[PDB]
Amino acid sequence: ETGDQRFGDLVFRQLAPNVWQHTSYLDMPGFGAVASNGLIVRDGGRVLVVDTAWTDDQTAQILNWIKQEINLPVALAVVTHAHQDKMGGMDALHAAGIATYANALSNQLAPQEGMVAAQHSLTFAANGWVEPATAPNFGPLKVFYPGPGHTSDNITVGIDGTDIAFGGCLIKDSKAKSLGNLGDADTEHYAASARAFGAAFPKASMIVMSHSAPDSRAAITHTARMADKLR
Numbered sequence: 001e002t003g004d005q006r007f008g009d010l011v012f013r014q015l016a017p018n019v020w021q022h023t024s025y026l027d028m029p030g031f032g033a034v035a036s037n038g039l040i041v042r043d044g045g046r047v048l049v050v051d052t053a054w055t056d057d058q059t060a061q062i063l064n065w066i067k068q069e070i071n072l073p074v075a076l077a078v079v080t081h082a083h084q085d086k087m088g089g090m091d092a093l094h095a096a097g098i099a100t101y102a103n104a105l106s107n108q109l110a111p112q113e114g115m116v117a118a119q120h121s122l123t124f125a126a127n128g129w130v131e132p133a134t135a136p137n138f139g140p141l142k143v144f145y146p147g148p149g150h151t152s153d154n155i156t157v158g159i160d161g162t163d164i165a166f167g168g169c170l171i172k173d174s175k176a177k178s179l180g181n182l183g184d185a186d187t188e189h190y191a192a193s194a195r196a197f198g199a200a201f202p203k204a205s206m207i208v209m210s211h212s213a214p215d216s217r218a219a220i221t222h223t224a225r226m227a228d229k230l231r
């Protein structure tokens with residue numbers, strides 16, 4: 001699509017003056033190439049990343065695109081649950097010297113999920129908001145744990161000062177026919193978790209998600225409506 005850029009195997013789309021979507025692809029036998037999206041945020045003189053790519057090599061391509069196109073140091077990455085599309089590239093982040101953060105529960109599940117744990121653990125209050133001392137110097141990133149849904153550990157991120165919030169694999173697009181990979185999902189709590197994400201970021205109008213292009217808030221309510229039928 002127009003204005004998108006491609007570096008190696010990766011596609012980048014600018015969403016706002018300081019925010020880009022990164023997209024990487026992995027051949028899933030019997031589906032074909034599955035896109036996964038994350039975010040890149042320029043926060044003054046540094047960059048913040050949300051989610052790895054599927055693989056280490058793809059994640060290194062993100063970092064080199066950042067070097068070439070933004071030319072600011074990457075201060076930290078937040079990864080949104082312990083599955084390959086979101087944490088497959090941890091080793092590349094660590095090799096590059098980027099501090100990594102994930103839900104404590106993601107870090108605990110990581111070995112069991114075949115992922116490398118982050119260096120730091122985020123913890124959350126009963127209302128879902130990150131405990132701030134666990135997310136030092138996060139700039140505009142506002143991290144929210146909406147409850148179990150796509151996985152028990154899934155987290156979400158709003159970008160303060162912008163219209164954007166990132167639902168990761170929890171949120172599906174508003175035309176979707178299904179909730180995707182439910183293999184690790186909590187079918188009972190999913191709908192409430194989707195709605196909690198919407199209530200956490202009530203003014204966000206651009207909802208970015210792992211497996212579809214950015215959508216409106218319709219993605220949230222549609223996701224929740226689909227999830228209500230799992231119960």
Ligand SMILES: NCc1ccc2sc([B-](O)(O)O)cc2c1
Pocket residue numbers: 026028034083084085086169180181
């Ligand atoms: N090659 C493993 C493989 C293939 C497709 C998906 S999709 C996915 B999820 O969206 O649930 O996080 C992880 C995953 C892992």
Ligand SMILES: [Ca+2]
Pocket residue numbers: 056088089090091092116
């Ligand atoms: Ca690895």
Ligand SMILES: [Ca+2]
Pocket residue numbers: 113183184
């Ligand atoms: Ca699993």
Ligand SMILES: [Zn+2]
Pocket residue numbers: 081082083150151169181
């Ligand atoms: Zn997943």
Ligand SMILES: [Zn+2]
Pocket residue numbers: 036085169210211
């Ligand atoms: Zn996914």
